[PDB]
Amino acid sequence: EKSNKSVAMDMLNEVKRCPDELFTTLSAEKQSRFRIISDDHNEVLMKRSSDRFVPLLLQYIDYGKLFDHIRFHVNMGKLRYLLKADKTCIDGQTRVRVIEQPLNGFGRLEEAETMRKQENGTFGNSGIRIRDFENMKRDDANPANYPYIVDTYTHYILENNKVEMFINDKEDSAPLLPVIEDDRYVVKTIPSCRMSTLEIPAMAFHMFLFGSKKTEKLIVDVHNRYKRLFQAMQKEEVTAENIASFGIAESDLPQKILDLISGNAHGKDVDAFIRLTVDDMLTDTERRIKRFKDDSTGKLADFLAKDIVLFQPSVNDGENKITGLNYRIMQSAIAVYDSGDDYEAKQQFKLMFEKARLIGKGTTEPHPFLYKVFARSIPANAVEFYERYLIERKFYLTGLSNEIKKGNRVDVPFIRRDQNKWKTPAMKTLGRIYSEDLPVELPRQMFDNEIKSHLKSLPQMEGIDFNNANVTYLIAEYMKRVLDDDFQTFYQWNRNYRYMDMLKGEYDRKGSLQHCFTSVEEREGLWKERASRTERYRKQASNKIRSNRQMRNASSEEIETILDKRLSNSRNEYQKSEKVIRRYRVQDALLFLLAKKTLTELADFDGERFKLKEIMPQLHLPQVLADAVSRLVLGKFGDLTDNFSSPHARRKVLAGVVMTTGTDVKDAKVISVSTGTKCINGEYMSDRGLALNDCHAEIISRRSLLRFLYTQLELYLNNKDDQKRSIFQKSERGGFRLKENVQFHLYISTSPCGDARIFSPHEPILEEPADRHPNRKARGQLRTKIESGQGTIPVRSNASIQTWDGVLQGERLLTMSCSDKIARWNVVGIQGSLLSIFVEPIYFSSIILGSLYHGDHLSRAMYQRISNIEDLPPLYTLNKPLLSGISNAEARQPGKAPNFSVNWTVGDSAIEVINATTGKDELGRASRLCKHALYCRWMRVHGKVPSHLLRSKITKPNVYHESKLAAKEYQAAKARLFTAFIKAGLGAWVEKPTEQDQFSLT
RNA sequence: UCUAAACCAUCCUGCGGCCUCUACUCUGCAGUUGUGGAAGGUCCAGUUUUGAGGGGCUAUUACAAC
RNA sequence: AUGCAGAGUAGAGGCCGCAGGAUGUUUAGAACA
Ligand SMILES: O=P(O)(O)O[C@H]1[C@H](OP(=O)(O)O)[C@@H](OP(=O)(O)O)[C@H](OP(=O)(O)O)[C@@H](OP(=O)(O)O)[C@H]1OP(=O)(O)O
Ligand SMILES: [Zn+2]
């Protein structure tokens, strides 16, 4: 419920808040001063969400009953009627068609509101039901539910910075509500006259000085002068001789009246306009063609729908052109169009434009060039359609330009020669339009002369030049000189503007332009000096762009244009903002004055003292198995090195493989043990397969496990009694398979280099969450050890393939990281290609780290990154082994990393010591683990296996690479793996030069 | 066996400048035709702290018709 | 309502530039089996 008192209090609570335009310019400290704590201990931003000056003033006049005759334009809801429940649209789909009309009228907000909603819930004297606000079925298709009126509280219509009003002849007139006819037409009333919202401060000021009745008489008198003028025009009784008699200043007459009496009445030149429009549009078309080739279908469809309708010829008062619903459908249809080169879908898309009568035979108003878009072929999607549309537009406009250049007359659909725009205006015709068809446009400065005459009589105003004094100025002088008041303190606070930053030309040490907060006095002075200061600004700013590495310095236009737009936009933003804030000041003065007047005359209140200046705002237990394998590997190593005393007992990384045959830890056997941290030097690659390429422990321990597997196949093939002791058995699928209970577990002293280690090279502080950046592209990426360099490096940075001659000259040899190699084992198996011709894929059940264990990283590295692996050949799978750290992590081994690498397989009398730099032992002899040795074992086993018992029966020559290729399924699993990594965007595997595996056994 | 210096080019943590996606909130705009530039919005340069003028360009407010 | 544009806030990335740590080689010295 509003009242005189409530409006007064709404005004005072308006002026304590910061205007939004001001708030933007203030320092954080001063912005903080509007953030208030309420009574109920709640923080409130005391900032204006909109300029409510004008509605507040209208409420003041209405509730005050201050105008006897003038009533403001109110809206009281919308009428909705159902035109058709089943309307076939241009896409041939049926939709409801609802039409809305606003219920606009004139009266005091309270009186109009009392009329709007009857007790029976109907609108005014219409009979038509007002639908409850909670009911929101806008798509409702039931004719019985229509017509209805949307429930909306009476508000003033305040659009386009205008206030529209109706002048009643008699006082105490009732609200003027629109009549509804045929449950369909809302019969509305042209306003008497329309006032700029920028005129409302002067009206308020006039009201405050003279009284609302004197204010009202003036508006009505001005209105009646315009009406008398427009009546005389219709009688052709307006001349240069008598124009002054109408009582309206030249600057408040339309130019056409001034042209007409001066004998200079003219239309615009349509041909010039056509020539200009065609050229402008051709240029724009080429701009759009270029931008698109250089570079949202929604954005495309917006352009296309507007343009298609622009080029649609109008006939019959425009009744033929595309209507609202069909427009929305056309635009949306385009936005989502994407056939798939489906013929029917293409036909359907073309048909839409046929039904809109834009293309096709028998069309009378076709689009001039759209049909060319569909000549030869229908475009497949919105993007193809936009391109073809623009090309065809270019050809059409070029044709027109060429005809214009020949001096010929051309016509475009959207320029219409019959519009008055192009004809000479007539007095009598124009008289009628001004009198009958439109509201009177009230002039600016209508209250100025009266305001100034009053103020001239006040002795406090004696020393002001009223010949250079606008009403904004005079309100402020009134507050200061008659009332000893001033604006709110926050209009003196320093403000920030980009434009003023540029003009001040102040940079911080990094080189960025500083945000200054200036006073109004400072800005006055910067503005005076803007020419010089703009020169300086541009010089520096151009260098900043020119210093940037991108090369656009040869072109002259590029930079100057960028800066032109920068300075224009900034300058315009600053000027408008400053002008508007100056309006907020005097608006606030007026609200304060009016509110204070209301409250003074209400109750025991002595408010003369108050001033605006004062206003302010599970088979095993994980850890048991982990610690078992850890102690057993470490222990077997301690045995082989004479209690870690032996010459080669020094190690940095240690690894090993443990076999389990059952849950009994008295059934755990150490299969192999190894140490090493280096890879071969490039000069020492062996084309006979006699060197070890990678001596990182875990890699060596797998190779030792291969030896053990060979030994077991031989044990089985030796004799029947031995078959019982061998871990292998025949498979019904052909070849050999492990016994049901048999499992292998890998143990490494430390995380495998690469994805499991690079990000987390330190021991986790326990209970720590995963890495804070798990989505970086670095994560999961394949990595290589790089020859003669530290760290493990993405494969993407070395895309080329490795060549033998290349490495030899000094290209650095790349070896896949241990993380990548073990993930590979978790797909293709640990046995490798050659054993896969005899045995079924074998996987590690567990990977156990003695230090540097990060499950988040280890799991990603070991399998998670390639969970998108598909089409694995039979018996292959993405193995997910038990991952675990140990109970008591190992200490950093002290000293420098030995250049040697130690191996041992179960059954061996001694360890073997290899120089990782050379791939060979101290005396330069080949390893029992080298390619050649393993090929030798493989050849002997091959000779002993009856050909019916082979998993792969492919026969190839006895070259290592060929023999590996015999393992067709394994190679296919390897291809699945590589594709998994690539498709996950983790880079392509790097292999050795193809010469590496091209040797025979002598 | 221990220590010092240098290189390789990635990774982590923090701080700047620039560009994108995801989620949430708010505002603006969204058929054609006719009339109308006194008004509202926009731009130009010896323009204003004074919603005041000047010169170029513009149908947004409203009305009826479909 | 739905779609298109603009602004704000938080998160996650990409590029450019700084500071401090982490991670296979090269050049020396001391000392030892
Ligand atoms: O990881 P490593 O133990 O060092 O050995 C492997 C193994 O080669 P060898 O068993 O012949 O030593 C791979 O062969 P498979 O057993 O999986 O069949 C081979 O891959 P290819 O099959 O493609 O030859 C790969 O070499 P690369 O991947 O570099 O081509 C090579 O690793 P290294 O090259 O690092 O020794
Ligand atoms: Zn490694």
Tab-separated table of N, CA, C and O (backbone and C1' of nucleotides) in Angstrom, chain A residues 160-162 164 185 188 194 256 268 318 321-322 416 419-421 433-434 441 444-445 468 530 571 574-576 578 582-583 585 650 773 779 790, chain B residues 1-2 8-13 16 31-42 44 47-53 59-62 64 66:
chain	number	residue	atom	x	y	z
A	160	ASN	N	11.646	4.386	-23.681
A	160	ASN	CA	12.306	5.276	-24.626
A	160	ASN	C	12.502	6.680	-24.040
A	160	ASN	O	12.495	7.664	-24.777
A	161	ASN	N	12.709	6.768	-22.716
A	161	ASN	CA	12.844	8.027	-21.994
A	161	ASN	C	11.670	8.968	-22.261
A	161	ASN	O	11.892	10.170	-22.377
A	162	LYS	N	10.430	8.453	-22.289
A	162	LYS	CA	9.268	9.314	-22.466
A	162	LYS	C	8.242	9.104	-21.355
A	162	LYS	O	8.191	8.037	-20.753
A	164	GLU	N	4.091	9.650	-21.317
A	164	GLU	CA	2.908	9.944	-22.111
A	164	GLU	C	1.742	10.276	-21.191
A	164	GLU	O	1.598	9.674	-20.129
A	185	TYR	N	-10.048	-7.181	-29.976
A	185	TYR	CA	-9.419	-5.889	-30.201
A	185	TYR	C	-9.445	-5.079	-28.912
A	185	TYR	O	-10.497	-4.951	-28.291
A	188	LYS	N	-7.453	1.299	-28.040
A	188	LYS	CA	-6.578	2.153	-27.249
A	188	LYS	C	-6.751	3.614	-27.666
A	188	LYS	O	-7.451	3.904	-28.636
A	194	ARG	N	3.409	13.919	-25.120
A	194	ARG	CA	4.520	13.111	-24.665
A	194	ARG	C	5.674	14.035	-24.294
A	194	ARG	O	5.986	14.962	-25.045
A	256	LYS	N	10.258	20.364	-40.998
A	256	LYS	CA	9.404	20.320	-42.178
A	256	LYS	C	8.466	21.527	-42.246
A	256	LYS	O	8.192	21.997	-43.347
A	268	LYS	N	13.746	13.440	-49.565
A	268	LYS	CA	15.079	12.870	-49.713
A	268	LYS	C	15.213	12.309	-51.129
A	268	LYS	O	14.204	11.983	-51.753
A	318	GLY	N	1.989	-4.986	-46.754
A	318	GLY	CA	2.940	-5.870	-46.102
A	318	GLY	C	2.310	-7.145	-45.549
A	318	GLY	O	2.968	-7.843	-44.780
A	321	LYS	N	4.275	-10.788	-46.126
A	321	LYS	CA	5.608	-11.107	-45.632
A	321	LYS	C	5.503	-12.041	-44.426
A	321	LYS	O	4.420	-12.226	-43.872
A	322	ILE	N	6.644	-12.627	-44.033
A	322	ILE	CA	6.686	-13.700	-43.050
A	322	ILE	C	6.271	-13.114	-41.699
A	322	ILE	O	6.774	-12.064	-41.309
A	416	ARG	N	11.285	1.776	-51.106
A	416	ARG	CA	9.961	1.882	-51.689
A	416	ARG	C	9.709	3.344	-52.013
A	416	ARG	O	9.636	4.169	-51.105
A	419	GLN	N	6.927	5.856	-50.419
A	419	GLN	CA	6.944	6.360	-49.048
A	419	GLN	C	7.162	7.878	-49.037
A	419	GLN	O	7.988	8.386	-49.796
A	420	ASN	N	6.436	8.580	-48.144
A	420	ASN	CA	6.487	10.032	-47.992
A	420	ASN	C	7.905	10.567	-47.824
A	420	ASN	O	8.182	11.680	-48.255
A	421	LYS	N	8.758	9.798	-47.135
A	421	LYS	CA	10.189	10.052	-47.020
A	421	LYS	C	10.747	10.696	-48.291
A	421	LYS	O	11.535	11.632	-48.199
A	433	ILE	N	-1.579	14.766	-39.844
A	433	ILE	CA	-0.805	13.729	-39.171
A	433	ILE	C	-0.394	14.228	-37.786
A	433	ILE	O	-0.457	13.475	-36.811
A	434	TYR	N	0.062	15.486	-37.718
A	434	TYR	CA	0.466	16.063	-36.448
A	434	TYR	C	-0.735	16.209	-35.506
A	434	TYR	O	-0.574	15.960	-34.311
A	441	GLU	N	4.518	16.159	-29.372
A	441	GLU	CA	5.834	16.055	-28.752
A	441	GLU	C	6.131	17.372	-28.051
A	441	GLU	O	6.382	18.379	-28.714
A	444	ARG	N	11.566	20.606	-25.169
A	444	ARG	CA	12.476	20.752	-24.046
A	444	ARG	C	12.562	22.236	-23.682
A	444	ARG	O	12.351	23.092	-24.544
A	445	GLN	N	12.832	22.508	-22.393
A	445	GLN	CA	12.922	23.837	-21.791
A	445	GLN	C	11.562	24.544	-21.729
A	445	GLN	O	11.506	25.774	-21.719
A	468	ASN	N	23.403	32.745	-19.291
A	468	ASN	CA	24.093	31.468	-19.442
A	468	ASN	C	23.853	30.617	-18.193
A	468	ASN	O	24.772	30.370	-17.409
A	530	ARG	N	43.661	17.522	-23.793
A	530	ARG	CA	43.450	16.186	-24.333
A	530	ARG	C	44.179	15.977	-25.664
A	530	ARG	O	44.547	14.844	-25.952
A	571	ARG	N	36.437	7.805	-24.603
A	571	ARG	CA	36.032	9.193	-24.462
A	571	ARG	C	34.509	9.276	-24.354
A	571	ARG	O	34.002	9.973	-23.479
A	574	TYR	N	33.189	8.184	-21.007
A	574	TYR	CA	33.493	9.121	-19.937
A	574	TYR	C	32.505	10.291	-19.981
A	574	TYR	O	31.911	10.636	-18.958
A	575	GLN	N	32.326	10.880	-21.170
A	575	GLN	CA	31.491	12.061	-21.324
A	575	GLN	C	30.049	11.766	-20.911
A	575	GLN	O	29.461	12.549	-20.167
A	576	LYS	N	29.493	10.640	-21.375
A	576	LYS	CA	28.109	10.306	-21.074
A	576	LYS	C	27.944	10.111	-19.565
A	576	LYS	O	27.025	10.675	-18.967
A	578	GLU	N	29.734	11.287	-17.074
A	578	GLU	CA	29.832	12.529	-16.321
A	578	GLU	C	28.540	13.341	-16.442
A	578	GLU	O	28.106	13.939	-15.460
A	582	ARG	N	25.796	14.204	-13.267
A	582	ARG	CA	25.364	15.570	-12.985
A	582	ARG	C	23.839	15.691	-12.929
A	582	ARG	O	23.324	16.590	-12.265
A	583	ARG	N	23.127	14.823	-13.657
A	583	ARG	CA	21.676	14.795	-13.635
A	583	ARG	C	21.198	14.157	-12.335
A	583	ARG	O	20.264	14.669	-11.717
A	585	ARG	N	22.629	14.288	-9.531
A	585	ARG	CA	22.778	15.245	-8.441
A	585	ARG	C	21.509	16.077	-8.257
A	585	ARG	O	20.995	16.172	-7.146
A	650	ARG	N	76.470	-51.979	-4.355
A	650	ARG	CA	75.988	-50.612	-4.475
A	650	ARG	C	74.838	-50.570	-5.480
A	650	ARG	O	74.908	-51.199	-6.532
A	773	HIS	N	46.116	-30.588	-9.832
A	773	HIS	CA	45.889	-30.267	-11.234
A	773	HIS	C	45.820	-31.564	-12.037
A	773	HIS	O	46.672	-31.823	-12.889
A	779	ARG	N	49.451	-34.893	-17.916
A	779	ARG	CA	49.107	-36.123	-17.219
A	779	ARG	C	48.840	-37.251	-18.212
A	779	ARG	O	48.130	-37.063	-19.198
A	790	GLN	N	68.556	-35.443	-18.361
A	790	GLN	CA	67.732	-35.901	-17.253
A	790	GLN	C	66.264	-35.627	-17.577
A	790	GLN	O	65.955	-34.871	-18.501
B	1	U	P	83.667	-46.481	-4.510
B	1	U	O5'	82.658	-45.395	-3.861
B	1	U	C5'	82.319	-45.498	-2.452
B	1	U	C4'	82.963	-44.369	-1.681
B	1	U	C3'	82.349	-42.971	-1.853
B	1	U	O3'	81.178	-42.792	-1.061
B	1	U	C1'	84.732	-42.837	-1.911
B	2	C	P	80.004	-41.776	-1.491
B	2	C	O5'	80.671	-40.342	-1.237
B	2	C	C5'	80.762	-39.832	0.122
B	2	C	C4'	81.617	-38.587	0.158
B	2	C	C3'	81.071	-37.343	-0.558
B	2	C	O3'	80.077	-36.658	0.198
B	2	C	C1'	83.400	-37.599	-1.009
B	8	C	P	71.829	-25.532	-21.739
B	8	C	O5'	71.140	-26.977	-21.766
B	8	C	C5'	71.413	-27.880	-22.874
B	8	C	C4'	70.839	-29.245	-22.572
B	8	C	C3'	69.311	-29.331	-22.456
B	8	C	O3'	68.758	-29.543	-23.749
B	8	C	C1'	70.407	-30.629	-20.729
B	9	A	P	67.817	-28.454	-24.469
B	9	A	O5'	66.443	-28.692	-23.683
B	9	A	C5'	65.749	-29.962	-23.829
B	9	A	C4'	64.675	-30.079	-22.773
B	9	A	C3'	63.553	-29.024	-22.816
B	9	A	O3'	62.275	-29.645	-22.728
B	9	A	C1'	64.418	-29.205	-20.637
B	10	U	P	61.002	-29.094	-23.545
B	10	U	O5'	59.812	-29.748	-22.696
B	10	U	C5'	59.516	-29.249	-21.360
B	10	U	C4'	59.524	-30.399	-20.379
B	10	U	C3'	58.644	-30.241	-19.131
B	10	U	O3'	57.301	-30.644	-19.379
B	10	U	C1'	60.823	-30.951	-18.484
B	11	C	P	56.049	-29.891	-18.706
B	11	C	O5'	56.252	-30.221	-17.152
B	11	C	C5'	55.914	-31.545	-16.659
B	11	C	C4'	56.320	-31.683	-15.210
B	11	C	C3'	55.693	-30.696	-14.215
B	11	C	O3'	54.352	-31.030	-13.875
B	11	C	C1'	58.009	-30.937	-13.757
B	12	C	P	53.283	-29.908	-13.437
B	12	C	O5'	53.778	-29.510	-11.968
B	12	C	C5'	53.618	-30.457	-10.876
B	12	C	C4'	54.302	-29.930	-9.636
B	12	C	C3'	53.750	-28.623	-9.049
B	12	C	O3'	52.600	-28.858	-8.242
B	12	C	C1'	56.137	-28.555	-9.108
B	13	U	P	51.371	-27.821	-8.190
B	13	U	O5'	52.024	-26.585	-7.410
B	13	U	C5'	52.182	-26.658	-5.968
B	13	U	C4'	52.934	-25.449	-5.464
B	13	U	C3'	52.340	-24.071	-5.789
B	13	U	O3'	51.237	-23.734	-4.953
B	13	U	C1'	54.696	-24.041	-6.110
B	16	G	P	48.565	-11.401	-8.569
B	16	G	O5'	49.321	-10.615	-9.741
B	16	G	C5'	48.829	-10.701	-11.101
B	16	G	C4'	49.811	-10.019	-12.022
B	16	G	C3'	49.386	-9.889	-13.491
B	16	G	O3'	48.686	-8.668	-13.703
B	16	G	C1'	51.498	-10.956	-13.376
B	31	G	P	9.970	-9.555	-33.342
B	31	G	O5'	9.685	-9.476	-34.917
B	31	G	C5'	10.621	-10.093	-35.849
B	31	G	C4'	9.924	-10.395	-37.154
B	31	G	C3'	9.497	-9.188	-37.995
B	31	G	O3'	10.532	-8.849	-38.910
B	31	G	C1'	7.673	-10.728	-37.758
B	32	U	P	10.770	-7.344	-39.422
B	32	U	O5'	9.485	-7.039	-40.331
B	32	U	C5'	9.416	-7.595	-41.672
B	32	U	C4'	8.037	-7.378	-42.254
B	32	U	C3'	7.644	-5.930	-42.560
B	32	U	O3'	8.227	-5.535	-43.792
B	32	U	C1'	5.786	-7.167	-41.677
B	33	U	P	8.786	-4.048	-44.034
B	33	U	O5'	7.428	-3.204	-44.073
B	33	U	C5'	6.538	-3.351	-45.209
B	33	U	C4'	5.181	-2.775	-44.878
B	33	U	C3'	5.117	-1.272	-44.602
B	33	U	O3'	5.208	-0.567	-45.834
B	33	U	C1'	3.578	-2.506	-43.233
B	34	G	P	6.078	0.780	-45.976
B	34	G	O5'	5.092	1.810	-45.244
B	34	G	C5'	3.961	2.309	-46.000
B	34	G	C4'	2.968	2.978	-45.088
B	34	G	C3'	3.462	4.212	-44.342
B	34	G	O3'	3.479	5.272	-45.290
B	34	G	C1'	2.034	2.852	-42.962
B	35	U	P	4.739	6.260	-45.462
B	35	U	O5'	4.449	7.104	-44.131
B	35	U	C5'	3.273	7.962	-44.103
B	35	U	C4'	3.003	8.453	-42.701
B	35	U	C3'	4.132	9.229	-42.011
B	35	U	O3'	4.078	10.596	-42.391
B	35	U	C1'	2.818	7.880	-40.494
B	36	G	P	5.415	11.447	-42.661
B	36	G	O5'	5.890	11.729	-41.154
B	36	G	C5'	5.216	12.721	-40.329
B	36	G	C4'	5.656	12.591	-38.888
B	36	G	C3'	7.167	12.697	-38.611
B	36	G	O3'	7.618	14.032	-38.396
B	36	G	C1'	6.351	10.691	-37.669
B	37	G	P	8.848	14.655	-39.228
B	37	G	O5'	10.080	14.393	-38.236
B	37	G	C5'	10.043	14.910	-36.870
B	37	G	C4'	11.283	14.475	-36.111
B	37	G	C3'	12.558	15.314	-36.302
B	37	G	O3'	12.592	16.400	-35.382
B	37	G	C1'	13.068	13.004	-36.597
B	38	A	P	13.179	17.846	-35.780
B	38	A	O5'	12.107	18.690	-34.939
B	38	A	C5'	12.536	19.821	-34.139
B	38	A	C4'	11.672	19.927	-32.904
B	38	A	C3'	11.918	18.899	-31.793
B	38	A	O3'	12.996	19.286	-30.953
B	38	A	C1'	9.569	19.268	-32.124
B	39	A	P	14.363	18.442	-30.909
B	39	A	O5'	13.873	17.208	-30.016
B	39	A	C5'	13.686	17.426	-28.606
B	39	A	C4'	12.626	16.503	-28.048
B	39	A	C3'	13.083	15.114	-27.569
B	39	A	O3'	13.634	15.111	-26.253
B	39	A	C1'	11.287	14.845	-29.020
B	40	G	P	15.213	14.891	-26.022
B	40	G	O5'	15.335	13.308	-26.100
B	40	G	C5'	14.821	12.543	-25.004
B	40	G	C4'	14.805	11.091	-25.394
B	40	G	C3'	16.160	10.442	-25.690
B	40	G	O3'	16.913	10.105	-24.532
B	40	G	C1'	14.632	9.840	-27.359
B	41	G	P	18.522	10.215	-24.532
B	41	G	O5'	18.967	9.202	-25.690
B	41	G	C5'	19.087	7.787	-25.372
B	41	G	C4'	19.475	7.012	-26.605
B	41	G	C3'	20.881	7.234	-27.169
B	41	G	O3'	21.972	6.672	-26.447
B	41	G	C1'	19.344	7.118	-28.918
B	42	U	P	23.440	7.338	-26.513
B	42	U	O5'	23.838	7.327	-28.067
B	42	U	C5'	24.403	6.120	-28.638
B	42	U	C4'	24.679	6.333	-30.107
B	42	U	C3'	25.923	7.155	-30.466
B	42	U	O3'	27.141	6.426	-30.326
B	42	U	C1'	24.101	7.767	-31.864
B	44	C	P	33.153	9.956	-33.278
B	44	C	O5'	33.103	11.335	-34.095
B	44	C	C5'	33.540	11.351	-35.483
B	44	C	C4'	33.364	12.729	-36.080
B	44	C	C3'	34.115	13.879	-35.394
B	44	C	O3'	35.455	13.924	-35.878
B	44	C	C1'	31.850	14.521	-35.845
B	47	U	P	36.542	22.539	-28.193
B	47	U	O5'	35.143	23.335	-28.150
B	47	U	C5'	34.064	23.036	-29.103
B	47	U	C4'	32.764	22.667	-28.409
B	47	U	C3'	32.785	22.458	-26.885
B	47	U	O3'	32.399	23.669	-26.250
B	47	U	C1'	31.590	20.655	-27.983
B	48	U	P	32.704	23.955	-24.699
B	48	U	O5'	31.514	23.177	-23.963
B	48	U	C5'	30.377	23.917	-23.446
B	48	U	C4'	29.606	23.054	-22.474
B	48	U	C3'	30.238	22.856	-21.090
B	48	U	O3'	29.982	23.941	-20.207
B	48	U	C1'	29.314	20.794	-21.907
B	49	U	P	30.883	24.200	-18.897
B	49	U	O5'	30.463	23.028	-17.884
B	49	U	C5'	30.612	23.226	-16.443
B	49	U	C4'	30.043	22.034	-15.707
B	49	U	C3'	30.399	21.903	-14.216
B	49	U	O3'	29.295	21.416	-13.462
B	49	U	C1'	31.178	19.988	-15.392
B	50	U	P	28.240	22.391	-12.732
B	50	U	O5'	27.243	22.668	-13.954
B	50	U	C5'	26.080	21.822	-14.132
B	50	U	C4'	25.380	22.202	-15.415
B	50	U	C3'	25.991	21.673	-16.727
B	50	U	O3'	24.982	21.069	-17.528
B	50	U	C1'	25.664	24.028	-16.851
B	51	G	P	25.315	19.959	-18.647
B	51	G	O5'	23.873	19.822	-19.313
B	51	G	C5'	22.719	19.608	-18.466
B	51	G	C4'	21.571	19.188	-19.352
B	51	G	C3'	20.156	19.272	-18.744
B	51	G	O3'	19.259	19.955	-19.619
B	51	G	C1'	20.552	17.138	-19.683
B	52	A	P	18.864	21.503	-19.412
B	52	A	O5'	19.296	22.263	-20.761
B	52	A	C5'	20.611	22.036	-21.328
B	52	A	C4'	21.056	23.227	-22.139
B	52	A	C3'	21.032	23.079	-23.669
B	52	A	O3'	19.827	23.512	-24.283
B	52	A	C1'	23.175	23.855	-22.977
B	53	G	P	19.503	23.148	-25.818
B	53	G	O5'	20.454	24.134	-26.653
B	53	G	C5'	20.541	23.965	-28.098
B	53	G	C4'	21.594	24.884	-28.675
B	53	G	C3'	22.101	24.524	-30.078
B	53	G	O3'	21.333	25.150	-31.102
B	53	G	C1'	23.956	24.805	-28.611
B	59	A	P	15.994	4.479	-40.185
B	59	A	O5'	14.763	4.471	-39.161
B	59	A	C5'	14.245	3.206	-38.652
B	59	A	C4'	13.930	3.338	-37.179
B	59	A	C3'	12.666	2.654	-36.651
B	59	A	O3'	12.849	2.439	-35.260
B	59	A	C1'	12.336	4.991	-36.645
B	60	U	P	12.264	1.150	-34.498
B	60	U	O5'	13.334	1.151	-33.308
B	60	U	C5'	13.013	0.497	-32.056
B	60	U	C4'	13.220	1.473	-30.917
B	60	U	C3'	11.965	1.923	-30.154
B	60	U	O3'	12.282	2.025	-28.782
B	60	U	C1'	13.107	3.819	-30.870
B	61	U	P	11.263	1.458	-27.689
B	61	U	O5'	9.966	2.309	-28.087
B	61	U	C5'	8.811	2.283	-27.202
B	61	U	C4'	8.339	3.689	-26.901
B	61	U	C3'	6.833	3.947	-27.047
B	61	U	O3'	6.171	3.425	-25.899
B	61	U	C1'	8.101	5.779	-27.947
B	62	A	P	5.145	2.195	-26.050
B	62	A	O5'	4.034	2.881	-26.968
B	62	A	C5'	3.032	3.693	-26.319
B	62	A	C4'	2.448	4.649	-27.324
B	62	A	C3'	1.381	4.085	-28.261
B	62	A	O3'	0.117	4.067	-27.640
B	62	A	C1'	2.887	5.438	-29.479
B	64	A	P	-4.840	1.105	-31.258
B	64	A	O5'	-5.086	0.873	-32.823
B	64	A	C5'	-6.142	1.610	-33.487
B	64	A	C4'	-5.953	1.534	-34.978
B	64	A	C3'	-5.935	0.135	-35.604
B	64	A	O3'	-7.233	-0.417	-35.808
B	64	A	C1'	-4.106	1.370	-36.399
B	66	C	P	-7.181	-6.093	-39.567
B	66	C	O5'	-5.943	-6.989	-40.044
B	66	C	C5'	-5.859	-7.369	-41.443
B	66	C	C4'	-4.503	-7.967	-41.738
B	66	C	C3'	-4.281	-9.438	-41.350
B	66	C	O3'	-4.896	-10.340	-42.266
B	66	C	C1'	-2.340	-8.122	-40.858
